[PDB]
Swiss-Prot record, chain B:
Lineage: Eukaryota, Metazoa, Chordata, Craniata, Vertebrata
Protein known as: DNA-dependent protein kinase catalytic subunit
Positions of region (Catalytic loop): 1092-1100
Gene Ontology molecular function terms on file: ATP binding; DNA-dependent protein kinase activity; double-stranded DNA binding; enzyme binding; histone H2AXS139 kinase activity; protein domain specific binding; protein kinase activity; protein serine kinase activity
Role: Serine/threonine-protein kinase that acts as a molecular sensor for DNA damage. Involved in DNA non-homologous end joining (NHEJ) required for double-strand break (DSB) repair and V(D)J recombination. Must be bound to DNA to express its catalytic properties. Promotes processing of hairpin DNA structures in V(D)J recombination by activation of the hairpin endonuclease artemis (DCLRE1C). Recruited by XRCC5 and XRCC6 to DNA ends and is required to (1) protect and align broken ends of DNA, thereby preventing their degradation, (2) and sequester the DSB for repair by NHEJ.
Annotated organism of origin: Homo sapiens (Human)
Result of altering L292R: In IMD26; shows increased long palindromic (P)-nucleotide stretches in the immunoglobulin coding joints indicating a defect in hairpin opening and insufficient DCLRE1C activation
Domain annotation FATC: ranges: 1240-1272
Gene: PRKDC
Length: 456, 1272
């Protein structure tokens, strides 16, 4: 059907469509022929390098969705093992799967069958609107496979497609109905939306990055959908005061915030997972305090005996002090040093009233030293020469941190510490008598780094 | 004829157009006309010749079926004979054999009985020219079903000889072209590669005169001539080869002319051998002006030139480079390159070993071309470094010994010798390295020839290399060493007297000026010469160890040698002088570990002689020094010498420990489960460091002994027991720390049905507390273990998780487990276990086996790896003989959400555990069953096929067992690596047959099952076991064989052949499937006899439904066990039943299911002892000694029937009708060769012949277990 040529494509596309039509009919219903066709079209939607086959297989699945509801009457839509209910269950099992090419298949299935199931109702409040969480977990499982495999792209696109219709459906149809229980939710008769955002709140600090993001944006689009139509600024203070202080701090701390065996770079993925959890806490705080949702001093400070500040201090004290896993560890530690810089930026530039909780441990030669070391020779802290987003984006987060730092008091260690590395004598002595010659590497690279730092 | 098929199909499908049957063939709703299926069919049926062939064939067949209505029988026969004459005209008249045309006529001639007697000679010649042999093979084998049927055999054998398949080729030069007795002898001499006496008694039996028992057929005279040609080709005496090529064609004076060109049989039979012998002789250096003139005069016309130019195309290149017209030799080598291209592209892909043979010539032809190109450079004759790196690459590139027959080595070495002689004469140091290159290359060829048992060619190569092997000291020691190791290797298949005679004479050639002044300079060469000296004396000594007198009875002047290096003190003299030579080798790659093995195996075999001078101390050092390198053979000697130190505990442990400490310890995983066994007993320190180092690099290997052996070992207050127990507990704490491996083990433990575990507990209590109420505190110490899973539903929840089986079982069995806790906790009687029986049957009725889904264990159902807490690493990696990489090993990543409870009594169930390799891996899990037997016999199969891959005879036949990874994670829980796309034999047998006959086989009193039961009951007296012993005194051979044939006649004969011809769609598919099945099953059967694998029901056999190869499974019986313990003995080495036989015919059962057995048995009784002592460690952990003795006997040469007698006498002392047992085991003395053969000293061939004539013996298959199904 989806062949390269026009003659054999425009032939055999109507073939497969017409067979989808006929095999979806009460005469061809409950037949091993039809289940064979469905199996074939699935293991075409979930396979390696034939992608032009995945596209057309998604089209075939949306045709299935059309004609299966178009044929099977509601008087018999209770014992069918091939109806849309079981189709969506098999899509879920295809999505919660360790294979980096079956989750992609369920992603494409949703992407093609969202144009339906959203123009249909009276049975759609239990299949998928409830199962946004399951495809969220699909984006969680996509944490490891490959950025360029297109699994995260399609998964984000379908969480997109699903939020853009759940937000509309459940703003008026928001009542204690017997909606089907999705995975991980507490067993209850009603799961309308309050526990949907309560689940989104259970982890905005899950270590897997893109699922965490999507959850955070799902709050920031869903919170103005309760009948109160309120906004997070007062809601987080309300829940923190009516549910205890420990709630909002702990549900962002993670699960494992509590050694020197990895003080030297090591790839033991226990360390990589602690780094991931630190990144999760960093991002969730940054995105909550940073906008007016909560105050910097509201959730930070010693009154609640927090844990972020301790581990971030330990970090900058012990970040920059097998052969190929070193680069992996370096990447995963640089992606979190950059995020703590962004955290300091969103901590200072948001309210210059809480810097007192930023104890002098980072205002010592721990924050500012990694600052200086990114500015000059960023490869010293493991920034691998050869990446794209990180290297081009570094002189942005570094400078924005400097500009958040200048206004605040801790511009003094700033000046007296930059001045120990970009003192004038360094620039003058770098510009020696001969800078044009065979000794390119050392002289030219040193000047390039110092000039780039000075331009920052 | 290219287009004849499309033409004919067009012509036939024209006349369908102007017929009124075009009424929309279905005219209903899902339509289409009745012509849009015919016109495009023919449109494509003239674009490709395969649809053309196949439409012509199906339409021919349809016409000849629909002519059965009209065309009365006489008219039928007239028409069919017209077709047959036309088809003979097709084959005889065709000019360029178009493979789809030839195959079309040649397989539509196969589907009709009248047309099946086509033309053996034309069939064969057209298959050979068309390179489509399997269609002809099917035709000839269906014509040879239902002299004409001796020239059919000649053509069949002619047509296999091009598809390799040499075993089934030799299987009819001994069963159809036969009936004399020198034929078998010479073919046997050819099979085991002794092509000296084989050709010798081809000549002397071709030169014979009278033989007053019958004149030899011409069909075997021409055979003998061809066989002598091929034999003389193997051991390449090209003198005799050209003489035999000219012998039977014309007179003794060589006239060579168009004599060969007439009567094409002369062409086919003599032209290859003729020019091979002549040109080879021209190549080694001679002129003889013999074949050159014939070739040159043949360079005219069409018939005399086209055949030789198109089908030799490389001998032409060599001859013309000899004539030094480089352009034409080039043209011919390139023409040979496209010749290989077109030939190889035309062998079917399923014709394995035809493409190997065609590919093996590419190396040689490329050598030819690259030399002619290298010599074309004018400056190449002035610069010497081009020669330097050409020699470097040519000594880097060799054919491989053990997988290239000696003709490829011959080709490469001779052609390279000619090339490099041309180079040397084209450039007058260089010539010193030239001579070195020739010498080393010929020595490499000798080594190859020697290590694949082509002894005589190696001897002749030493002889022709001896004249020039005197110029240098190293060349002297090289020649003497090569000849001496030749003698050692070739002195093994011989008789003991022959062995001692032939290895004694390589002693004077060893004490001459080769040990004079050269045992001082090259210490490694000195060590190799010492090894050869020591092994010479070893062979002589260990030879005369057989008998004290008759060995030193037939002897002569040589006896003074025996005297100088009574009659029982010479034993020790040879021993000790060999020991001195061997030790001086030892103090002086693998030469260090070659000395280590020679020393250690001398000591160990002399020990095993003595058990019926500290060798027990001596072996360990060299063993562990070699295990400090890589060695399967040195892997072994922990437990044997640890036992001989359990006898003598004072000496040589700390040296063992010191050497074991310093090694890369990745080499104990293959034996981990044997060394962790001894830690429960004394002297356990022998394996402490290396296990504690494995557990720090490859950390999972302790949980299996030390949750079972720990309570199976009683560690007292001994000064060393406490530290050993704290060592094992400390590794346990340092290995079992994550609670993840134990979590997987508990998930699988709960995956077992609660009913089976309760039944096991009931068996334990009924066998433990019922014998005598003296075993105290056992029930108290074991009840909590089963209560931790059974009883209250919350116990497994505390243990692993909330369990669905305990949810539907612990709740249902509440007031019974309450009673069990109240009374059975301290009852300690087991007097009245009817409560256990009723509880078990209640579990059978309302605790259904169909759990029906994996959700029953949520941890497995919701594994979903989320964090590193010691990820599982699915069990089955870590083979051994590699540096384990647990990062390339597949890690568990999820589970497939379905479980199928495959139906057995104990009922294991099979699970589809996922993996991160994006592939998938299914498994079986057995709960309550110990799997040390299966895992450990599979260890044995791995060592066996490691042996096999290293025997060249077995290797070229690609002889390997099929093994699956068995890994027990504890006693009462193992998993088994279930292979992909397989099926059991039972399902093929009952799925190929028809519904009527499956019904007749299942439900009918006359069926072999019902017939056998009624036979036993009606002429025995009773209905159950023990009737066989009552039978056997009134169950004479004749009546039993007649009844066996009666019952067998019911079940179809061609049934498994129907299976293979049913899933093939090609002749090549059928041919490859049947050959693969027969070969694999032959090695399955003989490897299962080397260590008695009983209980070979039809359901213990798996077979790929993608290759046809066979897999052995479910090794419950591992030694002679069904023949010694079971109430119904199994008096048969292996299943070779009726269907396996009737798979191959017209081929007889002694052509392919014989030669594979022979090569396998040869590879097995050519051992260091690997099988024997790995079996020693098989059985000697908690009469096993007589089991090992029987294995030694029936591996070192023995009669299968006396061995089965030994088994049965060990297991059936004073048993009823034991005389009849032994009489049916031993044979008849007039109908079974088994009986008519001696006790031992049987050769491989004779051993296996007796073995098969015991396996296919109707006197045992008539009386054996009813479920084994001896009729099918
Ligand atoms: C539809 O298939 C089949 C096949 C066999 C049977 C019964 O003989 C059968 C076989 C066992 C059994 N035992 C040990 N190892 C095995 C190893 C197996 N492997 C490993 C290699 O790859 C192929 C499968 C299979 C089965 C094994 C068993 F515990 C129960 C039964 Cl009832 N029933 N049905």
């Amino acid at each position: 059907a989806c062949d390269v040529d026009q003659v054999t494509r425009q032939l055999y596309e109507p073939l497969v469509m017409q067979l989808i039509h006929w095999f979806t009919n009460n005469k061809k219903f409950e037949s091993q022929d039809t289940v064979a066709l469905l199996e074939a079209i699935l293991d075409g939607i979930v396979d390696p390098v034939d992608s032009t086959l995945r596209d057309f297989c998604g089209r075939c699945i949306r045709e299935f969705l059309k004609w299966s509801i178009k044929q099977i009457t509601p008087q018999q839509q209770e014992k069918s093992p091939v109806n849309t209910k079981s189709l969506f269950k098999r899509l879920y099992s295809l999505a919660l799967h360790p294979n980096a090419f079956k989750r992609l298949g369920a992603s494409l299935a949703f992407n093609n069958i969202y144009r339906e199931f959203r123009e249909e109702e009276s049975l759609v409040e239990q299949f998928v609107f409830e199962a946004l969480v399951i495809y969220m977990e699909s984006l969680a499982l996509a944490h490891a496979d490959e950025k360029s495999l297109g699994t995260i792209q399609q998964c984000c696109d379908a969480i997109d497609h699903l939020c853009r219709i759940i937000e509309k459906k459940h703003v008026s149809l928001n009542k204690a109905k017997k909606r089907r229980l999705p995975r991980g939710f507490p067993p209850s008769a009603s799961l309308c939306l309050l526990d949907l955002v309560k689940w989104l709140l259970a982890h905005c600090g899950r270590p897997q990055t893109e699922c965490r993001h999507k959850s955070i944006e799902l709050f920031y689009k869903f919170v103005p959908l309760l009948p109160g139509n309120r906004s997070p600024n007062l809601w987080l203070k309300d829940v923190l005061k009516e549910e205890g202080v420990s709630f909002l701090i702990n549900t962002f701390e993670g699960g494992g915030c509590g050694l020197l065996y990895l003080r030297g770079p090591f790839s033991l993925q226990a360390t990589l997972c602690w780094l991931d959890l630190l990144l999760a806490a960093l991002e969730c705080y940054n995105t909550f305090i940073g906008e007016r949702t909560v105050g910097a001093l509201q959730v930070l400070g010693t009154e609640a005996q927090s844990s972020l500040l301790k581990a971030v201090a330990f970090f900058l004290e012990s970040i920059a002090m097998s052969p190929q896993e070193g680069e992996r560890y370096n990447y995963s530690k640089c992606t979190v040093v950059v995020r703590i810089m962004e955290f300091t930026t969103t901590l200072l530039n948001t309210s210059p009233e809480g810097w007192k909780l930023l104890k002098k441990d980072l205002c010592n030669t721990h924050l500012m030293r990694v600052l200086v070391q990114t500015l000059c020779e960023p490869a010293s802290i493991g920034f691998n020469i050869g990446d794209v987003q990180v290297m081009a984006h570094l002189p942005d987060v570094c400078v924005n941190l400097m500009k958040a730092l200048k206004m605040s008091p801790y511009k003094d260690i700033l000046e007296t510490h930059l001045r120990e590395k970009i003192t004038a004598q360094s620039i003058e002595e770098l510009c020696a008598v001969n800078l044009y010659g065979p000794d390119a590497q050392v002289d030219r690279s040193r000047l390039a780094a110092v000039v780039s730092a000075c331009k920052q | 004829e290219v287009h004849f098929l499309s033409l004919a199909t067009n012509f036939l499908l024209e006349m369908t157009s102007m017929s009124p049957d075009y009424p929309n063939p279905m005219f209903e709703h899902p339509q289409i006309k009745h012509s849009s299926l015919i016109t495009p069919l023919q449109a494509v049926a003239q674009r490709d010749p395969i649809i053309a062939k196949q439409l012509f064939s199906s339409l021919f067949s349809g016409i000849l079926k629909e002519m059965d209505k009209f065309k009365t029988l006489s008219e039928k026969n007239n028409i069919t004979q017209k077709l047959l004459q036309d088809f003979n005209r097709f084959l005889n008249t065709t000019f360029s054999f178009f493979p789809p045309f030839v195959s079309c006529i040649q397989d539509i001639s196969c589907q009709h009985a009248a047309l099946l007697s086509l033309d053996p000679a034309a069939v064969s010649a057209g298959c050979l020219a068309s390179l489509q042999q399997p269609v002809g093979i099917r035709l000839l084998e269906e014509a040879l079903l239902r002299p004409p049927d001796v020239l059919r055999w000649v053509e069949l054998a002619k047509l296999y000889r091009s598809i390799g398949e040499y075993d089934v080729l030799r299987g009819i030069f001994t069963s159809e072209i036969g009936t004399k007795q020198i034929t078998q002898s010479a073919l046997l001499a050819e099979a085991r590669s002794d092509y000296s006496e084989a050709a010798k008694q081809y000549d002397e039996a071709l030169n014979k005169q009278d033989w007053v028992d019958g004149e030899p057929t011409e069909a075997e005279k021409d055979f003998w001539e061809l066989a002598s040609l091929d034999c003389y080709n193997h051991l390449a005496e090209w003198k005799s080869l050209e003489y035999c090529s000219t012998a039977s064609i014309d007179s003794e004076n060589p006239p060579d002319l168009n004599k060969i060109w007439s009567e094409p049989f002369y062409q086919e039979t003599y032209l290859p051998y003729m020019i091979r012998s002549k040109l080879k002789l021209l190549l080694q250096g001679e002129a003889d002006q013999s074949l050159l003139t014939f070739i040159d005069k043949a360079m005219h016309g069409e018939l005399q030139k086209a055949i030789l130019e198109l089908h030799y195309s490389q001998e032409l290149s060599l001859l013309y480079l000899l004539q030094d017209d480089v352009d034409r030799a080039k043209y011919y080598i390139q023409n040979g390159i496209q010749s290989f291209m077109q030939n190889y592209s035309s062998i079917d892909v399923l014709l394995h070993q035809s493409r190997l043979t065609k590919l093996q010539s590419v190396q040689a032809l490329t050598e030819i071309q690259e030399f002619i190109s290298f010599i074309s450079k004018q400056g190449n004759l002035s610069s010497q470094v081009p020669l330097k790196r050409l020699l470097n690459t040519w000594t880097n590139r060799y054919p491989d010994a053990k997988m290239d027959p000696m003709n490829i080595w011959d080709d490469i070495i001779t052609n390279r010798c000619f090339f490099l002689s041309k180079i040397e004469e084209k450039l007058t140091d260089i010539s010193s390295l030239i001579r070195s290159c020739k010498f080393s290359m010929k020595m490499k060829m000798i080594d190859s020839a020697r290590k694949q048992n082509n002894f005589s060619l190696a001897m002749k190569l030493l002889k022709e290399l001896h004249k020039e092997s005197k110029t240098r000291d190293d060349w002297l020691v090289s020649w003497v060493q090569s000849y001496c190791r030749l003698s050692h290797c070739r002195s093994r298949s011989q008789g003991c007297s022959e062995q001692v005679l032939t290895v004694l004479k390589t002693v004077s050639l060893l004490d001459e000026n080769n040990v004079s002044s050269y045992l001082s300079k090259n210490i490694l060469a000195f060590r190799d010469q010492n090894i050869l000296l020591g092994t010479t004396y070893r062979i002589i000594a260990n030879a005369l160890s057989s008998e004290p007198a008759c060995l030193a009875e037939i002897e002569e002047d040589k006896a003074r040698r025996i005297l100088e290096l009574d009659s029982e003190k010479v034993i020790a003299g040879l021993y000790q002088r060999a020991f001195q030579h061997l030790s001086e080798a030892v103090q002086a790659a693998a030469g260090v570990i070659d000395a280590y093995m020679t020393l250690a195996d001398f000591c160990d075999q002399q020990l095993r002689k003595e058990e019926e001078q500290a060798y027990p101390a001596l072996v360990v050092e060299k063993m562990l020094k070699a295990l400090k390198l890589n060695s399967n053979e040195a892997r072994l000697k922990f437990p044997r010498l640890l036992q001989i130190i359990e006898r003598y505990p004072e000496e040589t442990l700390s040296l063992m420990t010191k050497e074991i400490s310093s090694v890369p310890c990745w080499q104990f995983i293959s034996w981990i489960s044997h060394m962790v066994a001894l830690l429960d007993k004394d002297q356990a320190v022998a394996v402490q460091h290396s296990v504690e180092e494995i557990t720090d690099n490859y950390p999972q290997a302790i949980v299996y002994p030390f949750i079972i052996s720990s309570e199976s070992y009683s560690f007292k207050d001994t000064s060393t027991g406490h530290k050993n127990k704290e060592f094992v507990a400390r590794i346990k704490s340092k290995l079992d720390q994550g609670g993840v491996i134990q979590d997987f083990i508990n998930a699988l433990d709960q995956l077992s049905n609660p009913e089976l575990l309760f039944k096991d507990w009931s068996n334990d209590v009924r066998a433990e507390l019922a014998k005598t109420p003296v075993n105290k505190k056992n029930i108290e110490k074991m009840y909590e273990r089963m209560y931790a899973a059974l009883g209250d539903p919350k116990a497994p929840g505390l243990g692993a998780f909330r369990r669905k089986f305990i949810q539907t079982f612990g709740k249902e069995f509440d007031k019974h487990f309450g009673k069990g806790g109240s009374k059975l906790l301290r009852m300690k009687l087991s007097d009245f276990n009817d409560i256990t029986n009723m509880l078990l049957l209640k579990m059978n009725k309302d605790s259904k086996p169909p759990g029906n889904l994996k959700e029953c264990s949520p941890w497995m159902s919701d594994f979903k790896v989320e964090f590193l807490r010691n990820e599982l690493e699915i069990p089955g990696q870590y083979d051994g003989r590699g540096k384990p990489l647990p990062e390339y090993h597949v890690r568990i990543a999820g589970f497939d959400e379905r479980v199928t409870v495959m139906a057995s009594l104990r009922r294991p169930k099979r699970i589809i555990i996922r993996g991160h390799d994006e592939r998938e891996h299914p498994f079986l899990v057995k709960g309550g069953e110990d799997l040390r037997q299966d895992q450990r016999v599979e260890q044995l199969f791995q060592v066996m096929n490691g042996i096999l891959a290293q025997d060249s005879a077995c290797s070229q036949r690609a002889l390997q067992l099929r093994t699956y990874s068995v890994v027990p994670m504890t006693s009462r829980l193992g998993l088994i690596e279930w292979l992909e796309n397989t099926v059991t034999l039972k399902d093929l047998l009952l799925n190929t047959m028809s519904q009527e006959e499956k019904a007749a086989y299942l439900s009918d009193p006359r069926a072999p099952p019902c017939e056998y039961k009624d036979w036993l009951t009606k002429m025995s007296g009773k209905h159950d076991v023990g009737a066989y012993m009552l039978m056997y005194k009134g169950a004479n051979r004749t009546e039993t064989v007649t009844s066996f044939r009666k019952r067998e006649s019911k079940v179809p004969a061609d049934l498994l052949k129907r299976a293979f011809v049913r899933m093939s769609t090609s002749p090549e598919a059928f041919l490859a499937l049947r050959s693969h099945f027969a070969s694999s099953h032959a090695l399955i059967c003989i490897s299962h006899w080397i260590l008695g694998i009983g209980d070979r029901h039809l359901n213990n056999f798996m077979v790929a439904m993608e290759t046809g190869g066979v897999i052995g499974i479910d090794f419950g019986h591992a030694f002679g066990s069904a023949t010694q313990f079971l109430p119904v003995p199994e008096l048969m080495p292996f299943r070779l039943t009726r269907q396996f036989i009737n798979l191959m015919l017209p081929m007889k059962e002694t052509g392919l299911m014989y030669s594979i057995m022979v090569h396998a048995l040869r590879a097995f009784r050519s051992d260091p002892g690997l099988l024997t002592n790995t079996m020693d460690v098989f059985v000697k952990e908690p009469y096993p000694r007589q089991k090992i003795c029987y294995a030694k006997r029936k591996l070192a040469g023995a009669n299968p029937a006396v061995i089965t007698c030994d088994e049965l006498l060990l297991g059936h002392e004073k048993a009823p009708a034991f005389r009849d047992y032994v009489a049916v085991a031993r044979g008849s003395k007039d109908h079974n060769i088994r009986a008519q053969e001696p006790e031992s000293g049987l050769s491989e061939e004779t051993q296996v012949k007796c073995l098969m004539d015991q396996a296919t013996d109707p006197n045992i298959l008539g009386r054996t277990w009813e479920g084994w199904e001896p009729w099918m």
